[PDB]
Design a binder for this molecule. Structure first.
Ligand SMILES: N[C@@]1(C(=O)O)C[C@@H](Sc2nc[nH]n2)[C@H]2[C@H](C(=O)O)[C@H]21
Ligand SMILES: N[C@@]1(C(=O)O)C[C@@H](Sc2nc[nH]n2)[C@H]2[C@H](C(=O)O)[C@H]21
Ligand SMILES: *[C@@H]1O[C@H](CO)[C@@H](O)[C@H](O)[C@H]1NC(C)=O
Lengths: 445, 445
C-alpha cells in the first residue's frame, strides 16, 4: 500500500523487496533488513550524493518513487502499475532501478518495455534477461549466471570432482542456473548423480527427502546448489538434523550469508560458495548507522523495520533507547551493485542532457519528456565511468555490454571452523575469465 | 499502426488470435496464418453471430468484439492487449477469449489479472497456467498438459519402450510438457537417455546438432517430443538430412498436421502423435466457405488472406474470380475449442444476468460494469451446458474444474504409408482417464 516519494526534476522509480513473501493468506511478510531496507537506503544515499555532485546533473534534481515488491513477482507488478499509470491515462518515471529476484525483474520488464521505460537491476542474474529480443529495456550492473555456472564447474574440474549432484529452487534464477552448470559440467567431463528441485512452500519433511535423495548416489559427495537463501538454509538444517556430510559448491543466493548457516554450522563446514565480486562502501555504513526513526521520516517503512529490528513499539514508547551505532554493522554484499545502478542511470541522463540541452544547465524542452528508447539505447548502454567509492586497489568501471550485462567477476569463499569454536567465511580466490585459487587458505585441500 | 476488428454490443469480449506468423528477425508480423489465425478468428465471429440470434442466451444483451492479432509473439500480443485494460484505467472489455500459444496466454494473463479481466483460452495447454496464485482470472476449454504428458508415458509402457530420448521447444509449452512427461515416464520404469532443447532461433546446422545428440544414445530409438509445429517440421528435415531413423511420439504441436511432415514423409513414417479430441463443427464450414472480400468487411485481415490464398491482387481486379467453396475445406483441429470458449463466457454472462438482473432481459445496474471477480469465481467456473454444434449423436458438455482447466480427452494417430502409395495420418487410439489402442490399425504393430 505505501510508496516512498522524493521530489526532483527527473524521478527515478525504484523497486526493492522491503518485506518477505507473506502467508498463504497475506501478500507481505516481515521486513527484510539486508536485501530490503539496506538496499533501499543505498538508493537514497546514492541520490543524496548525486544531488550534491557538481559534475553530475548540477542543474537537474533526481527525485524518487520507490516501491516494495514483497519478494513476490505478482505483487511487484501490482505496484509497478504506478510507473506506467500516467501514460495508460506519478506524472512521469524516467527509469527504474530495480528488481532483486530475477522473477520480479522479468515480470516488471514485460510491463516496462510496453512504455519504453529503461530498467537497471542491481541483483537479478538469470541468463534469460541477456536476450534483447524479449527484455529490450533491461540492463543490469551484475553479470548473468552464464558465467557463475562456468565458474562453479571450473572449481570442480580443478579439484577433479567428476561425480556430483545438484539442487536448485523453483524459479527462473535456480532452474536456469543449474542447467547452465550441468551444460558447462558435461563439457568438462563432469557427471551428474541426481538433479533436485526445491520450493519455499516445501516443509521440513520435504527438505529431508532431498538430502535422502542425494545419498542414493553416495559416490557423489559434492553437492552443487543454485538456491535461494532460505532454501540453502533449510537443506543445510535438514543435513545437520539427519547427520549428513556433503561438499557444497553454492551460488550467490547462499553466498557468504551468516543467516544461511547460523545453527547448522557443522553440516556447512567445508562448503565452497560464490558471491558476485563487490567491495564495501565506508560512507554507506556511516550513513546507515546514523539513521533514526525521528530523522528518517522519508522512508515510510523505517519505523516498521525499527520495531522488528529492536523488538519494540512506538505506541509503547520503548524504541528511543536503541541505536544502529551501538550494534554490529554488516553491509549487504550487493550494496555496490545498488549504488552503481543508481549512478549508471544518473550518468546516462547527464550524458543525454549534454547532448539534448547544450546551452542551459537545467532541464530543457528536449528532455520534457525524456524519450526512453533513446535514453536506454544511446545513453544507458553507452555509459563508461569509474565506479564511485571504489578502493584504491581495484579500478572498476560501470559499463554495460551488448546485452545490457555486467562483467563476470565473482569471489570464491570457504566456510571453516576457526579458532575457539567460531565459524567464518574465508576468501579462497576469484573467477574473472578463468579460475584463481590459493588452496593454502582451504583447510581440507 | 496495426488494425483491430471491432464489433459493437452491450458487453464487449476481447479476442486474441495469431492472425500472422512471427515476422523476420527485424519485422514483428509475418505472412497470414490461414488455419490458426483466420479460421480460428472467424470461428469466434461465427459464435458471436449465433449467440446474438439466440433467444435462450443473452436475449436482450448483445455481445460485441475487440479482436487483436498476436502475430504469434508474446511481446507483440502484450503491446496489443493494452487496448484491453485502458477502460479500467475507451472500450470496456468484460472478458477475453484468447491466447493460442502458451507464452502469449501467460503474458496476457499477467496483465489481465491486474484489472480483474477473465480470460478463456481455446488452445493454451501449459500446466503453468493451472496456478491460481498467479493466473487467478484464467480458464481454458482445453485440458492442461499433465494429461497429454501422462498419455505419452502410457503409450511408451503399452509398447514396452523403456529406454527413450526427449526433445522440447524452449518455452512454457515444451519445457513444462517434457518435465511432466519425464516424471510420468520415471514412475513407469522408463529411463531418459538424453533430453534436448530446441532454441528460439535455430539454424539447420543447430537442428542437425540436436539429431546428432540423439544419435549418441543408439539404443533409444524412441524420440518423445513436446515441440511447436515448425520445430517438429525442422527436426524431421535434419533427421532426413542425416539418414537418421526414430520412432517419434509427439504432442499436439505436431498433431495430425501435414505442415510438419511435408517433405520428410519417410523420416516421419511410423510416428505416434497426439491431437486433443475434437469434432468438426457443422454450420461453421458452410459459414466460412460463403465468405468473400466484399461481404466480409468486418474482418480487417480477410483481403490480405484472400490475396495470399488465391495468389492474386485487388490492385489488378484479379481476385473476384474466386471462391472458398470451389476449394476443399479442412476444419482447423481446435475450432470446437474456440466456439466452446465464446459460449462458456456467454453462458457465464447469461447465468450472472439471471442472478443479478432478475426482472429485465437488458443489462441492469448490477452488471454496469460487470464485476470480473464475481463473473469468474461464481459463473465462469460453474458453467455446465451442452457443447454447441456437437454431432447430433454426442452428449459432450462444456465445463471447467475448480481451477479453470478442461478435461483430458485425446486422439492418438499413426503416420502411415497408405495402400495407394500416399502418406497419411490414421486414428488408432484415444486417451480419456486411461489408454485405448487399436493395434490392428498400426502397421508396425
Ligand atoms: N541473484 C538473485 C536472483 O533472483 O537473480 C537470486 C536471489 S537469491 C535469494 N532468494 C531469496 N533470498 N535470496 C536473489 C539475489 C539477491 O537479491 O541478491 C537475487
Ligand atoms: N497447445 C499450444 C500451446 O502453446 O499451449 C501449443 C502450440 S503448438 C504450435 N503450433 C504452432 N506453433 N506452435 C500452440 C497450439 C495451438 O495454438 O494450436 C498451442
Ligand atoms: C509388453 O510386455 C509384456 C510383458 O512381457 C507383454 O505381456 C506385452 O504383450 C508387451 N506388449 C507389447 C505390445 O509388446
Amino acid at each position: 500500500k505505501k510508496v516512498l516519494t522524493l521530489e526532483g526534476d527527473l524521478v527515478l522509480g525504484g523497486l526493492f523487496p522491503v518485506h518477505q513473501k507473506g502467508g498463504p493468506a497475506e501478500d507481505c511478510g516481515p521486513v527484510n533488513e539486508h536485501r530490503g531496507i539496506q538496499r533501499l537506503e543505498a538508493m537514497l544515499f546514492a541520490l543524496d550524493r548525486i544531488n550534491r555532485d557538481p559534475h553530475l546533473l548540477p542543474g537537474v534534481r533526481l527525485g524518487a518513487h520507490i516501491l516494495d515488491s514483497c519478494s513476490k513477482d505478482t505483487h511487484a507488478l501490482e505496484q509497478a502499475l504506478d510507473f506506467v499509470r500516467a501514460s495508460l491515462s506519478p506524472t512521469a518515471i524516467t527509469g527504474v532501478i530495480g528488481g532483486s529476484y530475477s522473477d520480479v525483474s522479468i515480470q516488471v520488464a514485460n510491463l516496462l518495455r510496453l512504455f519504453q521505460i529503461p530498467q537497471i537491476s542491481y541483483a537479478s542474474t538469470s541468463a534469460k534477461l541477456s536476450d534483447k529480443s524479449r527484455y529490450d529495456y533491461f540492463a543490469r550492473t551484475v553479470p548473468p549466471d552464464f558465467f557463475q555456472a562456468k565458474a562453479m564447474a571450473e572449481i570442480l574440474r580443478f579439484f577433479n570432482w567428476t561425480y556430483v549432484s545438484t539442487v536448485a529452487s523453483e524459479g527462473d534464477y535456480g532452474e536456469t542456473g543449474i542447467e547452465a552448470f550441468e551444460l558447462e559440467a558435461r563439457a568438462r567431463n563432469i557427471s551428474v548423480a541426481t538433479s533436485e528441485k526445491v520450493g519455499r512452500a516445501m516443509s521440513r519433511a520435504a527438505f529431508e527427502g532431498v538430502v535422502r535423495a542425494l545419498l542414493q548416489k553416495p559416490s557423489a559427495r559434492v553437492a552443487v546448489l543454485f538456491t535461494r537463501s532460505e532454501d540453502a538454509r533449510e537443506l543445510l538444517a535438514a543435513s545437520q538434523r539427519l547427520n549428513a556430510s556433503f561438499t557444497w559448491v553454492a551460488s550467490d543466493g547462499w553466498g557468504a550469508l551468516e543467516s544461511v548457516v547460523a545453527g547448522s554450522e557443522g553440516a556447512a563446514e567445508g562448503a565452497i560458495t560464490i558471491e558476485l565480486a563487490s567491495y564495501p562502501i565506508s560512507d554507506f555504513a556511516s550513513y546507515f548507522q546514523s539513521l533514526d526513526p525521528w530523522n528518517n521520516s522519508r522512508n515510510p517503512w523505517f519505523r516498521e523495520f525499527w520495531e522488528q529490528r529492536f523488538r519494540c513499539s512506538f505506541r509503547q514508547r520503548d524504541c528511543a533507547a536503541h541505536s544502529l551505532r551501538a550494534v554490529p554493522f554488516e553491509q549487504e554484499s550487493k550494496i555496490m551493485f545498488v549504488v552503481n545502478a543508481v549512478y549508471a542511470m544518473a550518468h546516462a541522463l547527464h550524458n543525454m542532457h549534454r547532448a539534448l540541452c547544450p546551452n542551459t544547465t537545467r532541464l530543457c524542452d528536449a528532455m520534457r519528456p525524456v524519450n526512453g528508447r533513446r535514453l536506454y539505447k544511446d545513453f544507458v548502454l553507452n555509459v563508461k565511468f569509474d565506479a564511485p567509492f571504489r578502493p584504491a586497489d581495484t579500478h572498476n568501471e560501470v559499463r554495460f555490454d551488448r546485452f545490457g550485462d555486467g562483467i563476470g567477476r565473482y569471489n570464491i569463499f570457504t566456510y571453516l571452523r576457526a579458532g575457539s569454536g567460531r565459524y567464518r567465511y574465508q576468501k579462497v580466490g576469484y573467477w574473472a575469465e578463468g579460475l584463481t585459487l590459493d588452496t593454502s587458505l582451504i583447510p581440507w585441500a
